[PDB]
């Protein structure tokens, strides 16, 4: 079943994962790409 594969994979990926350290903690910087989808601009108050 694909459920067992996905569960094993997700358990392995989160096996011993340190949230305190970023990707490439001591190495080069990580590049973050940003998208924005503006749904509304509500109230422009003077």
């Amino acid at each position: 079943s694909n459920m067992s594969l996905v569960k094993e994979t997700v358990d392995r990926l989160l096996k011993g994962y340190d949230i305190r350290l970023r990707p490439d903690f001591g190495g080069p910087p990580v590049a973050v790409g940003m998208n924005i989808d503006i749904a509304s601009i509500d109230m422009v108050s003077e």
């Binding site: 998208n35 989808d37 749904a39 509304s40 509500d42």
Partner: protein, 255 residues
């Protein structure tokens, strides 16, 4: 609820929404032996409804309520209305003062976003504005101020301060009425039916004051001009106002 998988349904046009937590989270879960899961919760939603306020206050709108999954595209989550899907109650205890609930419909579409294609469910509530508050607030006052302006035509033309006072007071209160009437609407740029009615009333009262000014100007050169002018105004102002009322209401009602 927090221990099983729950779909990440959210409402797409909600400015803000909250669940209920008094006295406990207003939530219910039921699980049948075949694995079927029913999850219910009480919600209060402020949902945006872009109103086209042309024809205000005789304006009718379809306000939407759109929801979809936040992170699962159509390949992963599909929503479907049941036959008995959207049920309203008595509708009399609702908080619709300026509007009356006409009816509702449901729709389902597929929206393309930056992260995929998503099944989007919509409910449309039809709301028609009630013309009972703005009548009392604006239409009767403006009409009465126009009639008060007409009263100036039966005052003796020699009494300049009397008729000029009536004229200026009528114009100033029409200005105040215009401001008060506009205070209800958002600051839109286009013209609405209420603005039309108020502007026409203002034209009427200013035309009365201008008629008296002309009558006073012509009493020094040709009196019969003014003598006939007074009766002409007495007969032309109410007739023109009644005809404007007929045109205005027949237009804005059967439209």
């Amino acid at each position: 609820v927090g221990k099983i998988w729950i779909p990440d349904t959210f409402f797409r046009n909600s400015k803000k929404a909250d669940a209920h937590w008094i006295t406990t989270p207003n939530r219910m879960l039921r699980i049948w032996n075949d694995g079927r899961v029913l999850y219910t919760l009480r919600l209060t939603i402020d949902a945006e409804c872009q109103l086209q306020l042309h024809n205000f206050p005789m304006d009718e709108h379809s306000c939407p309520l759109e929801f979809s999954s936040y992170g699962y595209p159509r390949e992963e989550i599909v929503y479907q209305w049941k036959r008995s899907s959207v049920e309203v109650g008595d509708t009399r205890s609702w908080r619709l003062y300026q509007f009356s609930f006409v009816g509702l419909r449901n729709t389902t579409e597929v929206v393309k976003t930056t992260s995929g294609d998503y099944v989007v469910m919509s409910v449309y509530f039809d709301l028609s504005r009630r013309m009972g508050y703005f009548t009392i607030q604006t239409y009767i006052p403006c009409t009465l101020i126009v009639v008060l302006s007409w009263v100036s035509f039966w005052i003796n033309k020699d009494a300049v301060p009397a008729r000029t006072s009536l004229g200026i007071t009528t114009v100033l209160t029409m200005t105040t009425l215009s401001t008060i009437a506009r205070k209800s609407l958002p600051k839109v740029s286009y013209v609405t039916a209420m603005d039309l009615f108020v502007s026409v009333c203002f034209i009427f009262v200013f035309s009365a004051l201008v008629e008296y000014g002309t009558l006073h100007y012509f009493v020094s050169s040709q009196p019969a001009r003014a003598a006939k002018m007074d009766s002409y105004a007495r007969i032309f102002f109410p007739t023109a106002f009644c005809l404007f009322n007929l045109v205005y209401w027949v237009s804005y009602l059967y439209l």
